[PDB]
Design a protein around this motif. Sequence first.
Motif, short mmCIF file in Angstrom:
data_model
loop_
_atom_site.label_atom_id
_atom_site.label_comp_id
_atom_site.label_asym_id
_atom_site.label_seq_id
_atom_site.Cartn_x
_atom_site.Cartn_y
_atom_site.Cartn_z
N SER A 75 0.85 -1.18 0.00
CA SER A 75 0.00 0.00 0.00
C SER A 75 0.89 1.24 0.00
O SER A 75 1.91 1.28 0.71
N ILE A 76 0.50 2.25 -0.77
CA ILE A 76 1.25 3.50 -0.88
C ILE A 76 0.30 4.64 -0.53
O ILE A 76 -0.55 5.02 -1.36
N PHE A 77 0.44 5.20 0.68
CA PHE A 77 -0.47 6.23 1.17
C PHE A 77 -0.19 7.58 0.50
O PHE A 77 0.94 8.06 0.51
N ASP A 78 -1.24 8.21 -0.04
CA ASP A 78 -1.13 9.49 -0.75
C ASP A 78 -1.50 10.61 0.22
O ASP A 78 -2.65 11.04 0.31
N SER A 79 -0.50 11.10 0.95
CA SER A 79 -0.79 12.07 2.00
C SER A 79 -1.26 13.42 1.47
O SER A 79 -1.95 14.14 2.19
N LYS A 80 -0.91 13.79 0.23
CA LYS A 80 -1.38 15.06 -0.32
C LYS A 80 -2.88 15.07 -0.59
O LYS A 80 -3.46 16.15 -0.71
N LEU A 81 -3.53 13.90 -0.69
CA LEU A 81 -4.95 13.86 -1.00
C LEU A 81 -5.84 13.89 0.25
O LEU A 81 -7.03 14.22 0.13
N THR A 82 -5.30 13.55 1.43
CA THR A 82 -6.10 13.53 2.65
C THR A 82 -6.87 14.83 2.82
O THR A 82 -6.30 15.92 2.72
N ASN A 83 -8.17 14.72 3.07
CA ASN A 83 -8.97 15.91 3.33
C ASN A 83 -10.18 15.52 4.16
O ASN A 83 -10.53 14.34 4.28
N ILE A 84 -10.82 16.53 4.74
CA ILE A 84 -12.01 16.36 5.56
C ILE A 84 -13.13 17.13 4.90
O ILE A 84 -12.94 18.29 4.50
N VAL A 85 -14.30 16.51 4.79
CA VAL A 85 -15.53 17.23 4.45
C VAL A 85 -16.22 17.59 5.76
O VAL A 85 -16.55 16.71 6.55
N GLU A 86 -16.44 18.89 5.98
CA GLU A 86 -16.92 19.41 7.25
C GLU A 86 -18.20 20.21 7.00
O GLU A 86 -18.18 21.24 6.31
N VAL A 87 -19.32 19.71 7.53
CA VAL A 87 -20.63 20.31 7.33
C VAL A 87 -21.32 20.38 8.68
O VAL A 87 -21.61 19.34 9.28
#
Lengths: 331, 331
Positions: A287-299
């Motif tokens: 597995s190769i984790f893509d740390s630049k894509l991590t995001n949160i949807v906050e509503v």
Amino acid sequence: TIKVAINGFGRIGRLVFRSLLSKANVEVVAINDLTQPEVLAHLLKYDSAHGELKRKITVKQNILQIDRKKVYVFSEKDPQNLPWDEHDIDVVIESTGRFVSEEGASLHLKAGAKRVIISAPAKEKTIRTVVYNVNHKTISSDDKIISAASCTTNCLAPLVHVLEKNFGIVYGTMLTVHAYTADQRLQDAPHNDLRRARAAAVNIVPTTTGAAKAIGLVVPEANGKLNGMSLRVPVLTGSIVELSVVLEKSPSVEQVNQAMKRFASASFKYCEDPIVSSDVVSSEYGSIFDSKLTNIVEVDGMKLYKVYAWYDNESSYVHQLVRVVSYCAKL
Amino acid sequence: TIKVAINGFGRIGRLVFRSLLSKANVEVVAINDLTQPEVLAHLLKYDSAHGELKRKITVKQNILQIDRKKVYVFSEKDPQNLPWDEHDIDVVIESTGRFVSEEGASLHLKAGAKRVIISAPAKEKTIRTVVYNVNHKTISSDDKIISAASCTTNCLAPLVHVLEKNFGIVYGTMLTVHAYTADQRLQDAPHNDLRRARAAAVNIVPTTTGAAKAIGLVVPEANGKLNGMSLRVPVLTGSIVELSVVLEKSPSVEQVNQAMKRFASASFKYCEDPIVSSDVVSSEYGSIFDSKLTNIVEVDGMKLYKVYAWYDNESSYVHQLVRVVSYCAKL
Ligand SMILES: NC(=O)c1ccc[n+]([C@@H]2O[C@H](COP(=O)([O-])OP(=O)(O)OC[C@H]3O[C@@H](n4cnc5c(N)ncnc54)[C@H](O)[C@@H]3O)[C@@H](O)[C@H]2O)c1
Ligand SMILES: NC(=O)c1ccc[n+]([C@@H]2O[C@H](COP(=O)([O-])OP(=O)(O)OC[C@H]3O[C@@H](n4cnc5c(N)ncnc54)[C@H](O)[C@@H]3O)[C@@H](O)[C@H]2O)c1
């Protein structure tokens, strides 16, 4: 030093063979498929995605020679007719895609092999199922059949493990966008899955993923919390998982990424660069984790955490399976 | 009858031109691009994804002739130098991708056209943005500049509308698996988006989607509830959206599908067959709902609703844009 037979000398079986050439404690002494030895030797040597095997490869009769190593080549459609007792087989790697049930895989035990590792999820939930460096230490010396899960499960499981241990998963969804495989069709042709029937190199193809039924077996506390599917697309090899989950705690993006970096290993790579699928072809990481894509949807105070990891559905899975085989040597 | 000019005779501009040939209240009298008229004529005639336009197409000086119709061809990089006043242009279709800002599109107004439709999301959140058969009646005579949103927005908008009106959306995520477009690179080459820089026909490419900023403008009650991204993959045209949301009400899968089917129209297809992306190439529907894929992730009473819609990011958007143009011809 354990003796291995490879049943099903296909995409997974041949790459596993290539990788086992450099593992000191593991010798492949026999392979089985449905064709002449010369065909297998040619497909072993030349690989469209992963390049040429730079070893002297010869065939004499049913004997495949790799420099000084001798490998018996069989062509037996019924694994119960394979001469595993005569060759003192310690482990069969079952990579035909045609014997993933307990009864099917156990035909190798009846043939005389001591242990079987299925290169796919098992049909039954009761079979030991592992992702190396997530739960492979749950293997018992009493386990005669072991599943190494699926390529997507080996990609997904480190992410779920980290989120569960650090923050607690409530529920979520996963989607893998996934290279086409030999189970699909080059031209529109019969298949019981009417979308996998369709020309694979010109189509986006919605279908099932084995990670859906295997993830709860590899990370027990995440059982029943996730579902998802696969969109097969036209790349030869290379895939990506998007996991969107509600968490119990409320970490920042930086904390989620740091929790993933801390779990880095030979199986789990922490990536920081803006890469695309071809950049993971032939990777040895599961597995190769893509740390630049991590995001949160906050509503309105609700948080949906989205994390991404790549995998070469061939090579990533193969080296995970190889790590499982080596661990079984010490058993 | 309204006189139309097309600025940017590209994938979208040419398919819009093709479709307008069959709409009798709309005459394209001028087109603009950066090349010789002979080049434009040939690209109008032969289309790799959508087949040959079977009319007589001739070029004499800067006049493109299609059977009985005469169309002027220009090559002005700066739209303010275009002779829109002289040719009495009612509507400019701005499909270069280079004038999506209010100031950029307004160059067509300064040049003399009465109204501009951008074939993309506008830079500013204040520009009237519409998906036909979702909110196109919000167009007023004060709107001199109108955005027809993006191809993904036109696919997603009817699903968000139906869910929002029947069940209420709390929050969710969308992912589009999307055909490559002319904004990507054939071979690894410079791009401000380092993933769109990479060879598009061999890569899964994570990037932005215009639907993330456009959806809140088209279905106002859903503003701020969704975020998501795009994975560009190697198919010439054809795309799919997965939408995963929490809802206030708790409908069944059947009730979700029935609500989608009730909203069907020439913009929104209700599909019941197990299709793949090539089956929507050249579709005139803005969005094609895949009723077979609808499912719910249920975890201890928590529900995550997942729904799917296909679109030909070219033809689906093109026919939505032409419906906006016909509507503008009435007002
Ligand atoms: N390809 C991947 O990305 C991938 C990843 C992880 C796991 N897997 C799993 O590994 C297994 C093999 O996948 P693959 O991609 O290697 O497929 P494949 O088609 O390339 O390999 C299967 C091989 O088994 C041979 N075979 C078929 N029936 C046989 C039989 N009765 N006896 C002997 N040989 C037989 C075929 O000739 C072929 O060479 C499947 O269970 C698959 O789900 C595949
Ligand atoms: N391709 C799709 O799937 C898609 C879908 C929906 C919307 N759109 C949008 O429509 C627009 C056009 O996209 P496309 O795929 O047709 O791209 P394209 O590259 O095929 O078309 C752009 C055309 O404009 C011309 N051009 C460039 N700069 C110009 C200028 N200054 N003046 C005149 N002509 C100029 C180019 O030569 C080209 O023919 C973009 O905003 C894009 O985001 C594209």
